[PDB]
RNA sequence: UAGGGACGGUCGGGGGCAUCAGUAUUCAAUUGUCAGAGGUGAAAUUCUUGGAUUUAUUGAAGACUAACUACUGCGAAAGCAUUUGCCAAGGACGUUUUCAUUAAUCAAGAACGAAAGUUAGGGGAUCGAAGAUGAUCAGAUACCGUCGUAGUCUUAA
């Protein structure tokens, strides 16, 4: 028997109410139950008696906290297969002043989103720079690459250096 | 002189901020068996001194602290340090408390003051490391002194730890172990391999502790080492002065010979 | 009727550890860290290495007598990745598949609590 | 900066509920002032307890003039006095923890605000020259 | 519905000192177990049968204040997030309190600090901390006076 729970902000309930039946169909195929509470604003997920995969409660936990941290349902469901995981990079504790912090964070996003979209294409990940953290879904090599590019982007070196060396390493691993 | 509760108050009309004269009047009252009027004078000295002149208030605090360490109480010395903290920076006030404890010859209170320094100011800078080295050197344990200095140098930055090691080596040449001083000198010359600021420090410390065959030979190696003409001639002239102070004319000539060998390339 | 060990599995990047102590944790039983079952020096964090390590861990747990295991899954934590690697799911899947009963999933990765990077 | 002050009424008259005497106000004022109380505190206590609106309306003239005509004058005006004591309080606090630069900056502000109304009072010659901020 | 000052209940991650707590990290001690464990796209330097890595119990160190944390707050700006206490301070509001033009803007000068020294070749003319030399004081490496090393000068990181 196992049970996890996240609690989600109030503005998400009209979206989670919509996609909740699809959540129930994507977890009942793994034989694991889940409720969402609209009066306390939470999503809990419980291992039932018919559950024979014990690791799936961890991925269901990651799923409901991704639905908390605002990643779309068809983007979020890919946790349920094995070669996919979350990472939550922490960026707030690198530089002191607000001006340089938001300029390096906007540098991590990119002009028109080009840096972030090219990083998603290279690392095969789903990346959300949000607030003072950076969430990411992907394979584990992609998580390792996105952690090094974000933690080196909070230091002074421009992330398009890492996009360039990722293209170099892809076409240099293709031999 | 002004040495009472009436004559000092009458004669202090010309200079009310008289820190040394107020300290002497308070010590004269305490020798005159008036501790109450002595402490009243020691507390009103900083009040009769100016407000912006912090050094006079620190001097009145040190005077009340010395009177409390001589014929007063440790609570009055702590008030004197809180008073020192009410007259100046807290780390300097606690260092004045450590000095009053060293004057009162309390070894446990001196070690507690050096530890309270080596935590806060030991993580801040190297003055607490110097204080811990002073306390353990007066306690005659150079191993524990070097251990506390290395611990405080690890707690603080390491960019001044080279000058801290040179100061530890000079203190060990002064009143410690000469082999330990030469070992710390070699470690400092290793940490500053590009700078001969540790080489001249080692040579000056050995020549000060009368290690002539050490100082002149190491300075001759430094003068014939990878140095310029001025950097070679200064070290070779210092080594020749040390060798002539020892009585070595041919070695003083060979120092200049190595200088002429290294300056011409 | 069941007697419980505790799994203490550690799914870092670059390795996976399966280290099933007794219920206190003072006395360890059957550590078979991943990078020893099969090593190409890359596959040490792989699900195949994790399930090999979990299967002979469960073999030695069955020969000692432990039939069920409270499982504690730990990522590399600290000021680092904080998410479990590829082997944390595969280790406890193989421990459940190889006859050993599973209880009490919990994450004991070291959330660093206002850590040290400046 | 904000609009936070008092709104004096249109009436310059007695409030017509104020049955109390127009001289016992002055006796109460000099009672508080020679038990040693500053004129702003005189006015606010006379407002609050022995309730007058303000004593320039009910008495003849304002209360610093009442104290000066009753022989009860201040050595130094009230604003300058409170700024002097705030400056010396923060100076004693500064000669204490010598690392409160912030208090050093606001001591610069308090002394620069001493000198403004000090030279105002010199040009009006309320308190005389040869007064040079101790 | 210019300005200043007092009062009142306050407000704030504004400041200074002291105190308290937190879990990481690093190191050490004690076990349990055995052969590998870091790290990488792979590897390697490194750590290792006086037992590493992991696990449990502690202890010490220096930091730092996870989430909560916001187009929110405070500060003149740089900036400021643990508790508690002290020291002063500041702002908005309330005011039928007080003074009565006490006012606005910026040429010199300063405290602040975001505000710096990552590794190497080279010239040292001057200066020069570090080190040492004579008197002041129960106690004086500062004071006064000099010899003297890096550095102060330059170039890339």
Swiss-Prot record, chain A:
Subcellular compartments: Nucleus, Nucleolus
Statement: the UniProt record of this protein carries the keyword rRNA processing: yes
Lineage top rank: taxon: Eukaryota
Effect annotated for changing residue 58 to S: In temperature-sensitive mutant KRR1-18; grows normally at 25 degrees Celsius but fails to grow at 35 degrees Celsius
GO cellular component, one term: nucleolus
Keywords for the protein's UniProt record, in alphabetical order: Nucleus, Ribonucleoprotein, Ribosome biogenesis, RNA-binding, rRNA processing
Subunit structure, interactors included: Component of the ribosomal small subunit (SSU) processome composed of at least 40 protein subunits and snoRNA U3. Interacts with snoRNA U3. Interacts with MPP10, KRI1 and with ribosomal proteins RPS1A, RPS4A, RPS4B, RPS8A, RPS8B, RPS11A, RPS11B, RPS13, RPS24, RPS25, RPL4A, RPL7B, RPL8, RPL23, RPL25 and RPL28.
UniProt protein name: KRR1 small subunit processome component
Organism the protein comes from: Saccharomyces cerevisiae (strain ATCC 204508 / S288c)
From Swiss-Prot, chain B:
Sections of the chain in a coiled coil: none
Transmembrane segments: none
Annotated localization: Nucleus, Nucleolus
Ranges of the HAT repeats in the UniProt entry: 1-31, 105-138, 176-208, 210-245
Subunit field text: Interacts with snoRNA U3. Interacts with MPP10. Component of the ribosomal small subunit (SSU) processome composed of at least 40 protein subunits and snoRNA U3.
Function comment: Involved in the biogenesis of rRNA. Required for the formation of 18S and 5.8S rRNA.
Note: Present with 8860 molecules/cell in log phase SD medium.
Protein name: rRNA biogenesis protein RRP5
Organism classification: Eukaryota, Fungi, Dikarya, Ascomycota, Saccharomycotina
Gene (UniProt): RRP5
Curated annotation (Swiss-Prot), chain C:
Keyword NADP on entry: no
Subunit structure of this chain's protein: Component of the small ribosomal subunit (SSU). Mature yeast ribosomes consist of a small (40S) and a large (60S) subunit. The 40S small subunit contains 1 molecule of ribosomal RNA (18S rRNA) and 33 different proteins (encoded by 57 genes). The large 60S subunit contains 3 rRNA molecules (25S, 5.8S and 5S rRNA) and 46 different proteins (encoded by 81 genes). uS11 interacts with eS1 forming part of the mRNA exit tunnel. uS11 interacts with snoRNA U3. uS11 interacts with MPP10. Component of the ribosomal small subunit (SSU) processome composed of at least 40 protein subunits and snoRNA U3.
Organism: Saccharomyces cerevisiae (strain ATCC 204508 / S288c) (Baker's yeast)
UniProt protein name: Small ribosomal subunit protein uS11A
Chain's role: Component of the ribosome, a large ribonucleoprotein complex responsible for the synthesis of proteins in the cell. The small ribosomal subunit (SSU) binds messenger RNAs (mRNAs) and translates the encoded message by selecting cognate aminoacyl-transfer RNA (tRNA) molecules. The large subunit (LSU) contains the ribosomal catalytic site termed the peptidyl transferase center (PTC), which catalyzes the formation of peptide bonds, thereby polymerizing the amino acids delivered by tRNAs into a polypeptide chain.
Transmembrane segments: none
Main location: cytoplasm
Keyword Cytoplasm attached: yes
Swiss-Prot record, chain D:
Superkingdom as given in the UniProt entry: Eukaryota
Family matches, as CDD domains: Ribosomal_S15p_S13e
Positions of post-translational Phosphoserine modification: 24
One GO CC annotation: cytosolic small ribosomal subunit
Subcellular location(s) per record: Cytoplasm
Entry-linked InterPro entries: Ribosomal_uS15, Ribosomal_uS15_arc_euk, Ribosomal_uS15_N, uS15_NS1_RNA-bd_sf
Record-listed cross-link Glycyl lysine isopeptide (Lys-Gly) (interchain with G-Cter in ubiquitin), residues: 31, 35
GO biological process: cytoplasmic translation; maturation of SSU-rRNA from tricistronic rRNA transcript (SSU-rRNA, 5.8S rRNA, LSU-rRNA)
Keyword tags: Cytoplasm, Isopeptide bond, Phosphoprotein, Ribonucleoprotein, Ribosomal protein, Ubl conjugation
Signal peptide from the UniProt entry: none
Transmembrane parts of this sequence: none
One example GO MF annotation: small ribosomal subunit rRNA binding
Biological function: Component of the ribosome, a large ribonucleoprotein complex responsible for the synthesis of proteins in the cell. The small ribosomal subunit (SSU) binds messenger RNAs (mRNAs) and translates the encoded message by selecting cognate aminoacyl-transfer RNA (tRNA) molecules. The large subunit (LSU) contains the ribosomal catalytic site termed the peptidyl transferase center (PTC), which catalyzes the formation of peptide bonds, thereby polymerizing the amino acids delivered by tRNAs into a polypeptide chain.
Family: Belongs to the universal ribosomal protein uS15 family.
Record's protein name: Small ribosomal subunit protein uS15
Source organism (scientific name): Saccharomyces cerevisiae (strain ATCC 204508 / S288c)
